[PDB]
Amino acid sequence: MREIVHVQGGQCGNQIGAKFWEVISDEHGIDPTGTYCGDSDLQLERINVFYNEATGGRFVPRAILMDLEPGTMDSVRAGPFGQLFRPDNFVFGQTGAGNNWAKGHYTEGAELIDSVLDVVRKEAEGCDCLQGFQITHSLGGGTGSGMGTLLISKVREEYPDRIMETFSVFPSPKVSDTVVEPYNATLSVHQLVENADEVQVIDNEALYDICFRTLKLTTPTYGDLNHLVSAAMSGVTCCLRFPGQLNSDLRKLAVNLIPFPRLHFFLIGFAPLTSRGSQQYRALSVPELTQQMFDAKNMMCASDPRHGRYLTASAMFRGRMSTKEVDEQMLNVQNKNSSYFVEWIPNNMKSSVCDIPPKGLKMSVTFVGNSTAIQEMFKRVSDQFTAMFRRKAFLHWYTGEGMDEMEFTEAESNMNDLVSEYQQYQ
Amino acid sequence: MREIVHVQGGQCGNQIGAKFWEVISDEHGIDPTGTYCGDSDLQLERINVFYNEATGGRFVPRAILMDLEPGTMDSVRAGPFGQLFRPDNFVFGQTGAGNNWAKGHYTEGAELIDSVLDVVRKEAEGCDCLQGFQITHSLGGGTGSGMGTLLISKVREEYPDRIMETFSVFPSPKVSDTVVEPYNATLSVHQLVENADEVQVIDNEALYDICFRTLKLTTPTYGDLNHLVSAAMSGVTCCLRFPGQLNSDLRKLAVNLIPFPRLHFFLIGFAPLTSRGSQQYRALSVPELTQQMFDAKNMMCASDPRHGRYLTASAMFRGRMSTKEVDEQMLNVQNKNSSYFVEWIPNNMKSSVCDIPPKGLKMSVTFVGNSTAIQEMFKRVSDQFTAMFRRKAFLHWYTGEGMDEMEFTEAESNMNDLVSEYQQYQ
Amino acid sequence: MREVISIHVGQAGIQIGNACWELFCLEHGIQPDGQMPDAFNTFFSETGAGKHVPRCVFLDLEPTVVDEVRTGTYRHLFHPEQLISGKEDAANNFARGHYTIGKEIVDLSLDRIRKLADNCTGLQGFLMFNAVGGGTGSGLGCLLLERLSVDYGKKSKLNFCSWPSPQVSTAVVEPYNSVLSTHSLLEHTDVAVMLDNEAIYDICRRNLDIERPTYTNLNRLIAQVISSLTASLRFDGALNVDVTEFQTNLVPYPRIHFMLSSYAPIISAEKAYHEQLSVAEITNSAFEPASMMAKCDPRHGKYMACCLMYRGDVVPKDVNAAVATIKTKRTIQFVDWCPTGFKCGINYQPPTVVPGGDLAKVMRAVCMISNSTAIAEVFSRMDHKFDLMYAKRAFVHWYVGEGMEEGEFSEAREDLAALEKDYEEVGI
Structure with missing residues (x-):
């Protein structure tokens, strides 16, 4: 029937996605040990949308867990509802993108995307007929916003007609951590408006x-x-x-x-x-x-x-x-x-x-x-981006990993037109 | 019925063939002592394809174990399913072809081939009409690649219309033992493209x-x-x-x-x-x-x-x-x-x-x-062969031992023709 | 059956052989009497009631070091006429070892070798242990190998030369003896393995942390190399290697048979405490250029062919993983005409430790014997020493009065000059 593949990036994505595997688990009545309890047909009739049979009777989530540090992956398996996931759906990084979008998308993510796209294809092509993919990540971080948005670009090249429903958590309006917020946000949005x-x-x-x-x-x-x-x-x-x-x-x-x-x-x-x-x-x-x-x-x-x-x-x-x-x-x-x-x-x-x-x-x-x-949001991130770009602050890590100055100007231009086209219809 | 005569050559061939007889005995239900257990007709009705009755009700393999070095044949005998083989089917050597195709084929292979060919004819003529022969050997060694390919040449002269299947291991691409691999491999292929x-x-x-x-x-x-x-x-x-x-x-x-x-x-x-x-x-x-x-x-x-x-x-x-x-x-x-x-x-x-x-x-x-x-694979062996042959490296072990310079040029020409025939179809 | 005959010539040969035969006795569990309380047939013979005698000869011109074996703990292990001693020393003279005093004991030595080799066919080869720095090791070594080449023609002949060091000498006339020996072992040996004394001195200083070692500490390390070399003859393994296997696999040209050896790990009993002896790291330490056993840094050469003997708890997949890392390491250099340059051999039996020694019990070990073009410098360096001393004929009158002719210096020098040009031509 119809299945949704759930694909998780970053520390924020994995802590948000741990609770999806809690709230869907108890609504469908799935024991964290794998089995079913609750003796009602209506939960069990349409279960292939999020779960897979494992010929032991247990249900394994159709979840793809990806991060560049094992630290949040230790947190996921240790907690409640942590035995549910297949360990082969876990893919690790060892170095960690230190809130650098460049090494999330170009440098460190390049050697890992080949592995994680292999796992998504095993789940995607493994069914009858897929409906769509859903993504949880951040925009402020490096390993959520860099490697998660690269995956969106790569999977759209294979599956153009399937839907994509994504939660991205934005930079905060008033006070925000992670001083490279607009560099991670604006660089992600111009690829997210074309691929999501x-x-x-x-x-x-x-x-x-x-x-x-x-x-x-x-x-x-x-x-x-x-x-x-x-x-x-x-x-x-x-x-x-x-x-x-x-x-x-x-x-x-x-x-x-x-x-x-x-x-x-x-x-x-x-x-x-x-x-x-x-x-x-x-x-x-x-x-x-x-x-x-x-x-x-x-x-x-x-x-x-x-x-x-x-x-x-x-x-x-x-x-x-x-x-x-x-x-x-x-x-x-x-x-x-x-x-x-x-x-x-x-x-x-x-x-x-x-x-x-x-x-x-x-x-x-x-x-x-x-x-x-x-x-x-888009004006607030853009003018924070424009202020920090005019005198070239923090650019040399992103130029250091193989970008140019021209991709930053395109990223601003692609999102500035999005501000104007909302204003056109207001 | 139809029979396969098994010929096991070299250290690699003997321990690949030792475990072959482990799996076929297991599937036909043969005890390592030679008796049958399992009480099913389907296992036993066609057993003469690989076994011979021994008028004590035990089944002995139609296998000829052949080596120039008495080490590895002792290992096969001492192991499990080692008492299954007939002791006369073992043909020892004393000297050992030291990863030299010359002494496998020409000089030390010649004085043992009369002994092994007697045993193969004893098994081959013994049945009504045999189907064919299967050989397990290595091409990166001396006694598998030299004396095993000599046996292929002699048995094709005697029994020209019977089938001849070869399970041969080749040199590995990336890191590879026995430094004269391309000499042994190329010289063995041109003797195997015409006779297998x-x-x-x-x-x-x-x-x-x-x-x-x-x-x-x-x-x-x-x-x-x-x-x-x-x-x-x-x-x-x-x-x-x-x-x-x-x-x-x-x-x-x-x-x-x-x-x-x-x-x-x-x-x-x-x-x-x-x-x-x-x-x-x-x-x-x-x-x-x-x-x-x-x-x-x-x-x-x-x-x-x-x-x-x-x-x-x-x-x-x-x-x-x-x-x-x-x-x-x-x-x-x-x-x-x-x-x-x-x-x-x-x-x-x-x-x-x-x-x-x-x-x-x-x-x-x-x-x-x-x-x-x-x-x-043939290009990888051929360019490694042409690398070494241009400088006449390691040639005096071959040329001094009773072959000529022209057989190497023929070997490269025959394998380059095999490359050309593949290329015309792709 | 298949057996190998060991020849020990000179004082260095005998003392290395004392350590070598102590290791062989302990690993097969035979006592110094000679009887244990048939895989090991390659090194010991059979004498009646369960009792085994070694397949070796000890040759020396002085009585001193052979009588000290005869009165030691191993009195009855050796056959009394396997230990041959003459009357007077060769006294650091190459000419004395061939022409004066050498001829009187070689005839008795060949009689013993013939009786010990005609027990079986399938004689695998000969091992020679000698010093090229001495008189009897160098002089009588050549005379025996000329005699052995005439009788036992096609048999493999491995040589283990305790080569003179660049810095430490223990002799002044050794540049003369070394150039004369190398000329005459070039056309008599199949494979010559270069051992240097100050190389093992520096190994035992950093790895074993022995500040003040002796010859007895050196010879244990040499014995472990020989044990790892011939382990495949004695014990069953996943991928065995013969004595005749080395000459097909290591020596690309007839004149180029001079190699460089290494052993890893060499770790002390305190030092083993903290360390995982993984297959990856014992192979890394084998190729580590400071850890050669010949004092020739292989950064200034190109490796030509390399043979690795794994011994112990070694799985074949970790060999393949470890050797792939070495090939991709770009500070290790290979010659252009040899794309595949490895032979691996894997044995089951772990290395045996001598009680009261300095090595620790290890689960796995590597012995690496390689041909490289870095041996060009070790021949150039004596050639610098040889010209500096022969130019005005120092020490020549000892040699010419002793029975050889002036001109054998010149012939040996041009032969070494030919060998140096051969190493240069092969590298390019």
Whole structure:
């Protein structure tokens, strides 16, 4: 049937992807020892989308784990749900790209891409017929942003017509670590706009807002932050795995929410999100869900969507629920917030209802939006890039690994036009 | 019935042949003491192809063990399955050809060939009509390459119309023992291109590659390498010893692989070959057999087959398997990888199905293919030969011992003609 | 059956042979009496009730060093007429070893060799141990090898010359004896292996950390090389190598048979504590240019043919992995006309350690014997010494009055000049 190959790069990608193999595992009822528990058909009917039979009855993930240091790979296997992965799907690096995009893409990644592309082809061609690939990485780092974006370029050359759905976590708006942020971001984006089908952006500053103001957690760990992003990452592909009244895939979302091929950067949100105390107190309804969904404080992107217009937007609902209140509230929000939607696409909203909610809720929604308010990220990274490039700061490691100055000018130009083409339709 | 007379020459040939008789005795159910156990008709009905009754009910191999140095024959006798061979079939030498093809062929080979040829005629004339002869030897040594190729010349003069299959190991490409390899190899090939019906090439370095990357065996000894070659040796001759849906003996393979008499050099492959860890993960089916058999990674010759075209190839399947997937997968491999097969031959592939798999497996296949990518090996030996011959290096050990200068020039001319005949078809 | 005959000529030959036969006795577990409480047939014969006598001859012109063997611990191990001693020393004179006093003992020596070699056919070859710096080792060494070439024609003849050092000499007339010997062992030997004393001095200083070694420490190390050479004759192995195998595999031209040897590891008992003796690193230390056993740095030559003897817990895949790294290492240089330049041989039996010695028990070892063009300098260096001394005829009257003619100096010099030009022509 349909299978998604999940491909993980970098320390950030592997800690985010460890929680995908936690949240998908318990939603499909897979024991970390491999076996199944939970005695229901509906989890087991459509399991080949993420798992493979191993003729022992155990299920091994279709996951490709790639990093340039073994340190985060030690963390993955030691933890819970760490025995699940096949060890041959692990591929190691020994040296480590020290937050250098150049040695992630050109120098150190060159000897490792031959190995990791071999493992992806064993998984890809090994099935009947593949649907698509999904990637988790960073843009700020070296081994996520360098080797992960090289893999996207290499796999697109082999499989041009399959979809690509990628989580890249962006540089932070206010305060950011890893002083070469704009060199890693801008260099990655100009190859990511030409080789990725859908990219939905996550910000660490956005997740700090969510966990403070909505979740009301006093001490949010990256264990908790990655769990929240993994919840939304289940939600976008949930409707492939469980039946529903109105079905949707990633290709359903792909044809619908990207109007022109250049602009395919998305916002993610999740609802419901209430603290531990207020599980018993909140009335779980579709009208309250849509109010939480159209809020900047629910968004996992550190932008204000009210400063621009939602070009196209989509809501993947989950749970045994009435479709009128799904449909009429989506009409209600389009009539009320006239100025927050674009005019020349009438009825911008996509709804899809999948019948099986995530574990522990009774109804949930996962929200994607193609907004033109994403200009705040691209302008903020570009002027940080332009400031640091004018007097040639930190260039000599990237020139030292075999780039030129001309590729930097192209990288700025390719992303500066992306800023203008959002502004054209605002 | 039909019989194979086995001739085992050199130290390499004796310990490859010692483990050959281990695997054939195991599959026919012969105790190392010579008795039978297993109480099944299919093992025992065709046993005269490799064994002889000894009027005490024990079975003795039709093997002639031949060496110039008494070391390695003592090792074969002392080991397991060493009491199986007839003591008269051992023909010792005293002096030893010190990696000199001259003393293997002309001077010290001559005084022992009368002794070994008596024993071969005793075995050959003993039956109703024999089918052919199979020789295991080495071409980088003295007593395998010199005296073994002399025996080929003498037996082709006596029995001209019988088949003659050779399992010969060649010099390894990259790092290689016995510094006069190209002298021994080139002088042995021109004596083997005119007098052998089918020659199947093995490299040690290809076997090391198999045991590292497929078998995942950490410390492969020569016991393990010989076990792999013995598996392929049994797979060529399955149809003689066991029934099947589509039988194929050695002459069936000869008429169906070699279009012109000069080109008879074959690549050998075996499938399945999986590690202990990955044994329990795999679906052991006919589509999986055909994918593993068409790898450069699986072939037991150090010649990359994708650099040439398969002129003609054959696959001897074993087990209870369905014959349309035997047919359709062989069609599938011709159609999809269409560039690797030659155009002026329609339907290049030969299939045979035997019903008895090797012990402990459910289905297996042996691949014998006539590829023009074996040009790469003959060029590597020829340029190494021309490197040394121009400077007259190491020549006085050969020229002083009873050959002439003109035989070297003939050897290079005959092997350069073999290179030219391959080149005209690619 | 298949056996090899050892000849020890001179004081150096005898003392090296004392260490060599101590190692052979201990590895086969025969006691100094000669009887153990048939693979080892290549070095010991059979005398009746379980008892074994070595296949060797000891030759010396002084009685001193052979009578000291006769009164030692190994009185009854050796046959009494395998230890031949004359009456007066050759006294550092090449001419004395051939023409004066040498002829009286060679006839008795050939009688012993003939009786010891005609027990079987399939005699594998001869090993000679001698010093070219001396009188009897150099002079009588040539006379025996001329006699052996006439009788036993096609048999392989390996020579182990304890070559004079560049710096340390222990003789002043040794440039004369060395040039005269090299002329006359060129047409009599099949394979000559060069051992230098100060090379083993420096090895034992850095590797064994023995600051003040003696000849008895040197001879143990020489004995380990010979044991590793002939291990394949004695023990069963994955890939065996013969004595006759070396001449087909190592010597590309008839005149070029002068080599350079190495052994690794040489590690002390304290030094073994901290170290994994991997197949990769014992082969790296073998090619490590400071760790030669001949004092000729092989950076100023090109390797021509190389033979590696692995011994012990050695898997064949790690041999292939280790030798591939050596070939790709670009500071090791090979000659253009020899693209494949290796013979590997692997044996099962680990090296045996002598109790109270200085080596440690090791699981695996390598003995490497190579032909290189770096031997050109060791012949040029004596040639510089020889011209500097012969130019005004120092020490000549000892030689010419002793029975040879003036002119054999000139003939030997031009032969060495021919050999130097031969090494230069092969490198280009």
